[PDB]
Amino acid sequence: HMQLSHRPAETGDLETVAGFPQDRDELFYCYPKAIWPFSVAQLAAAIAERRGSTVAVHDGQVLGFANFYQWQHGDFCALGNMMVAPAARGLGVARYLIGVMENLAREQYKARLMKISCFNANAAGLLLYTQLGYQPRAIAERHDPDGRRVALIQMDKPLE
Length: 160
Ligand SMILES: CC(C)(COP(=O)(O)OP(=O)(O)OC[C@H]1O[C@@H](n2cnc3c(N)ncnc32)[C@H](O)[C@@H]1OP(=O)(O)O)[C@@H](O)C(=O)NCCC(=O)NCCS
Description:
Keywords: Acyltransferase, Metal-binding, Transferase, Zinc
Bound molecules: coenzyme A
CATH class: Alpha Beta
Binding site for Zn(2+) 1: 6
Number of strands: 7
Shape: globular
CATH architecture: 3-Layer(aba) Sandwich
Structural class: alpha+beta
Largest sheet: 7 strands, mixed
Domain N-acetyltransferase: 14-160
Radius of gyration: 15 Å
CATH superfamily: Gcn5-related N-acetyltransferase (GNAT)
Protein name: N-acetyltransferase domain-containing protein
Number of helices: 5
Binding site for Zn(2+) 2: 58
Oligomer: monomer
């Protein structure tokens, strides 16, 4: 059923992708420095300062997005802005796209490790990365937009 493809993000994709976060919690999870409501301008500013912004496509629809917010040649990349269209969740889009990003870290950056950080409330995120072989390494305190204390779970995975 799912025949996924990927390509670099394009201008025309930004309206779609900016529609993906459904609430303030989802935006915080994937882009904690953004302010609700999300906007194309905020997404474009992330793209401009990051690397590897990639979309996943199925049946002619952009269904997922990700990029790197850290990249260190020969060392590691950190994967962020991971978001999937709400109508397409639970179908393997993030799994697919994380694979693609792992290959790109290996290929382009000669990375031996992928890092991700997932906020504590985001069970789907934590289970996603656990299923894909990431292990938790540390927990950092952060604050949410209401000033409330949250836990940021830093995970990683060897790439090879
Ligand atoms: C988290 C998110 C990216 C998952 O994307 P997705 O394409 O729906 O996930 P996939 O279908 O590829 O799922 C892969 C794994 O993620 C986990 N997962 C995804 N959705 C889940 C849910 N609703 N509940 C529990 N686990 C879930 C599971 O471990 C799943 O593996 P399995 O189906 O073999 O059990 C998506 O829910 C999303 O965009 N959320 C808002 C943004 C966000 O939180 N981003 C940061 C998290 S990466």
